[PDB]
Design a protein around this ligand. Structure first.
Ligand SMILES: O=c1ccn([C@@H]2O[C@H](COP(=O)(O)OP(=O)(O)O)[C@@H](O)[C@H]2O)c(=O)[nH]1
Lengths: 619, 68, 67, 81
């Protein structure tokens, strides 16, 4: 008589209360939706990061009786036990929108059992692995502790049934344990990308999405050193009642690479209202200001008729598809010359690299302009007073002014056949850096014949940038079109947040986001909603490139009013992406677990027998 | 509005290297000045308001009687 | 952010007749933790990384007079 | 298409005094019932119709009226031109 209705949740991964990857976000943005559903019956569990944890967590004393209700008493007692046996953990709220309650397991306080545990594991599978793996040891210590905690909860609790959700292989040890100990909880496992999948497109090259049906079973994990780890991931995936990934495209790798068609898909929501005067028109002007002092001396074109394009995020040169972008771009320049077009594109690249801060050449620009601005402004409020005064008494440029204007202009001259740079920084390894190398090869040097300009800002943007004075969320609202033509991207929060900000974006059907979006919008109405999905799965690499160039040309060749109606449709799409809607997909998977584990209790609750073979099936 | 154009114009010239009052503006100015003329030899008033007992109100009669 | 929120809630009440939310406390309490001094660590006497710190005349004087 | 681009034309030539009123009340009631999206679109259609009210287009009739007047005063004179 375990309760299915009023039941409990335990979500685990290594990124609870400490940033390590993107999962820290997903779990975090998800918080307030999931906390509203469950209030005090939801608990994030994860390994304690003794450094960051104190800034992240409101530390609480679980020992007081007020620390849990009479209904939830069991967890208190599970913890009592859990300290009794010399395991130590931090209990408290996570200091994030939602205040979700958290359990943080001091993995040092159990490194004692390490040997017996690292042991019990391959002896529940195959052969062990070098001590040269600080990662899996922690993965394991964590899993065993968590398993242990769930046992005790299931031991002491009998009111509620317990759903234990697990994110990514590192927190997936607990899973084999729970099957092989047959403990009274139901488990869900979400992979945010396959482990095999990361390695295969690492350097190179296998028509990944093409020749992976046809890939060496184990040997491939073997050759990469990933073998013991693949096995945990594989072990994790198969042990859980429910197996999930974040995007349709990631469930294609999941199926063939870990051998289980995921019972569903948990695509990542955002809290939209954390994003939503004209913002676009205003941030654009702050960009404009940097473009002015960047192209100083040789400013041949109309910023009134200039479009901003950007790619941004961790510097994965080929996965992030920065290769295709710089490429599609040179081609776009070509087309634009021929059609003798009057438009100009400045394309930005906001991917962080090894640097020595800003080129002197660049700081002079955003100095001399800030300078010209002041003078122009001083000279004009002077004109103001002289004019107004004349007017008010009835019945322009002084010499002093000309002298200073003429200086500000000289100050701005371009050092003789010197061209607007393609970086804004001093590059630690300039002659090798992948991005500059590509830009060099396709020969975009911001020549005034070029209609496409290239600027590469090898740093995440921060608002008090002396050169580009914007928060990245400001820089985005500011641009016109985001270009994220990815190869490997299990979700890709960039295109998502870009869209949520009401900016049109180009994505790809091999992007977690792109896949989800394709499978959402009716194919054709995509382009007009301001999402361009570029096929990078079924087309020749060169075919795709030409398709990105098509979409680009289409965007340039658009009336101000067209651009606007598009933008508007992308604002309208923002509502599809809020947790409130993506969050139902988590409820679908848990309810799967709650069924598959307690089928007769289920058939008794719903009053009838529903299909369990897959997530949506049951609803 | 006239002067902030003049701004834009100067600043655009400068950043673009290698009567700035465009006669659209020149007009609207010529206009707001005319709007200020004082109707034939009438003087700036000595009250801001439509007084009631205009004629017998003490503060006024004394201003007039000292011809200010 | 917390105060213009209070603003709206207050003004709205007033305008209809006849303060700190939880969400707010959570974030304030974070901003404060963010600010802690790394344990008997003292406010610096320079604001920069000094190329020749141990020799620089000014720091040397400040050190000697123990401020 | 009038309804979408922002112009409700209430029929007051043909219909009753009174049957016009119920048609005004219609258009209003119809308008209220829009969600705040449907609305922002309607406003976008309206502003787009601005381009048809410009003198820069409307003037061409004043251009015709003047031409016809010349034709008419100097008929064969015109025929040559
Ligand atoms: O100047 C910047 C540029 C990027 N980002 C963030 O970098 C993160 C990385 O994006 P994503 O989660 O899609 O992962 P990535 O695509 O970078 O691998 C995104 O959340 C962006 O909001 C940022 O915070 N500041």
């Amino acid at each position: 008589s375990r309760d299915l209705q009023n039941h409990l949740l335990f979500e685990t991964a290594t990124e609870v209360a400490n940033r390590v990857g993107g999962i820290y976000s997903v779990l975090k943005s998800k918080a307030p939706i999931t906390v509203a559903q469950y209030k005090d019956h939801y608990h994030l569990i994860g390994p304690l990061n003794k450094a960051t944890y104190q800034n992240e967590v409101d530390i609480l004393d679980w020992k007081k009786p007020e620390a849990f209700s009479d209904e939830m008493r069991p967890v208190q007692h599970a913890l009592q036990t859990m300290e009794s046996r010399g395991v130590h953990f931090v209990y408290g709220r996570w200091l994030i929108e939602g205040a979700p309650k958290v359990i943080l397991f001091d993995l040092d306080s159990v490194r004692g059992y390490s040997n017996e545990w690292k042991g019990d594991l391959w002896s529940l599978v195959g052969i062990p692995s070098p001590e040269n793996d600080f990662e899996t040891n922690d993965a394991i210590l964590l899993g065993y502790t968590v398993a242990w905690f769930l046992g005790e909860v299931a031991h002491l609790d009998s009111q509620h049934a317990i759903v234990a959700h697990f994110h990514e292989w590192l927190a997936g040890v607990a899973l084999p344990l729970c099957r092989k100990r047959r403990i009274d909880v139901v488990t869900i496992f979400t992979t945010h990308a396959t482990l095999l999948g990361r390695y295969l497109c690492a350097s190179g090259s296998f028509d990944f999405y093409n020749c992976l049906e046809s890939v060496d079973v184990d040997h491939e994990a073997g050759r990469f050193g990933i073998y013991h780890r693949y096995c945990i991931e594989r072990a994790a995936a198969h042990s859980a009642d429910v197996f999930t990934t974040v995007s349709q495209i990631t469930a294609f790798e999941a199926e063939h690479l870990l051998k289980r068609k995921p019972d569903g898909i948990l695509p990542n929501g955002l809290n939209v209202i954390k994003f939503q005067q004209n913002l676009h028109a205003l941030k654009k002007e702050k960009i404009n200001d940097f473009v002015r002092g960047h192209f100083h001396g040789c400013f041949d074109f109309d910023l009134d008729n200039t479009l901003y394009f950007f790619i941004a995020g961790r510097y994965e040169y080929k996965n992030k598809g920065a290769d295709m972008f710089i490429e599609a771009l040179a081609r776009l320049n070509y087309r634009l010359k021929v059609s003798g077009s009057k438009k100009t594109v400045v394309a930005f690249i906001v991917m962080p690299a090894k640097n020595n801060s800003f080129t002197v050449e660049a700081l002079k620009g955003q100095a001399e302009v800030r300078a010209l601005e002041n003078t122009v402004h001083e000279v004009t409020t002077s004109i103001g007073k002289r004019i107004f005064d004349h007017a008010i008494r009835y019945p322009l440029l002084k010499s002093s002014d000309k002298v200073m204007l003429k200086r500000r202009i000289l100050a701005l001259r371009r050092p003789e056949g010197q061209l607007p740079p393609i970086v804004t920084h001093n590059m630690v390894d300039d002659a090798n850096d992948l991005i500059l190398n590509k830009i060099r090869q396709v020969q975009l040097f911001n020549s005034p014949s070029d209609r496409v300009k290239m600027i590469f800002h090898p740093e995440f943007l921060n608002a008090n940038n002396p050169i580009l004075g914007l928060d990245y969320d400001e820089f985005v609202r500011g641009c016109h079109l985001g270009v994220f033509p990815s190869y490997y991207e299990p979700w890709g929060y960039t295109p998502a947040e870009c869209t949520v900000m009401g900016v049109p974006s180009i994505t790809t059907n091999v992007s977690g986001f792109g896949s989800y979006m394709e499978d959402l919008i009716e194919t054709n109405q995509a382009k007009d909603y301001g999402i361009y999905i570029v096929d990078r799965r079924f087309k020749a690499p060169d075919e795709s490139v030409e398709q990105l160039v098509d979409y680009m040309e289409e965007f340039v060749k658009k009336t101000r009013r067209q651009r606007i109606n598009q933008r508007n449709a992308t604002e309208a799409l923002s509502d599809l992406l809020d947790w409130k809607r993506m969050g139902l997909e988590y409820v679908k998977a848990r309810q799967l677990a709650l069924r598959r584990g307690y089928p007769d209790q289920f058939r008794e609750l719903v009053g009838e027998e529903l299909n369990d073979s897959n997530m949506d099936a049951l609803a | 509005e006239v002067t902030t154009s003049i701004g834009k114009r100067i600043f655009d010239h400068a950043i673009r290297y290698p009567e700035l009052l465009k006669s659209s503006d020149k007009v609207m100015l010529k206009r707001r000045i005319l709007a200020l003329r004082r109707p034939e030899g009438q003087l700036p008033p000595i009250v801001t308001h439509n007084m009631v007992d205009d004629a017998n109100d003490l503060i006024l009669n004394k201003i007039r009687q000292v011809q200010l």
